[PDB]
Amino acid sequence: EEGYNHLECHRKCTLKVFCKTVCEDVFQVAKAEFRAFWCVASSQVPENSGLLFGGLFS
Amino acid sequence: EEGYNHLECHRKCTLKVFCKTVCEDVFQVAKAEFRAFWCVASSQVPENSGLLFGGLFS
């Protein structure tokens, strides 16, 4: 989930005095499904393994 | 001077909850000049005078 933001403004004047300005700011939530996969040597005959490191950081 | 009246309304909904309705009612003043005249026998020879009453009410 992440959030995004709209910002809408309009201005209105009445009898040349009394200026009204409203500023609306809507915050909505955008969702997304992810599916993480991972490869395993299941054919038992590789030439070279590939991608020689396995350390992580968050 | 007399007064006249406008009435404006619009409705707005945000995120399907929180319905906003504003109802504005403007009262303005309309002006007018009047000039009241009155006729006088200045030729001294009428046949008949005309309009035989002179009483008023407000």
Curated annotation (Swiss-Prot), chains A, B:
Annotated membrane topology: Multi-pass membrane protein
Disulfide cross-links: 9-23, 13-19
Compartment(s) of residence: Cytoplasmic vesicle, Phagosome membrane
Function: Pore-forming protein that plays a central role in antigen cross-presentation in dendritic cells by mediating delivery of antigens for cross-presentation. Dendritic cells bridge innate and adaptive immunity by capturing exogenous antigens on MHC class-I molecules and presenting them to naive CD8(+) T-cells. Acts by forming a pore in antigen-containing compartments, promoting the release of antigens into the cytosol, enabling generation of MHCI:peptide complexes and T-cell priming.
Protein name, entry field: Macrophage-expressed gene 1 protein, processed form
UniProt source species: Homo sapiens
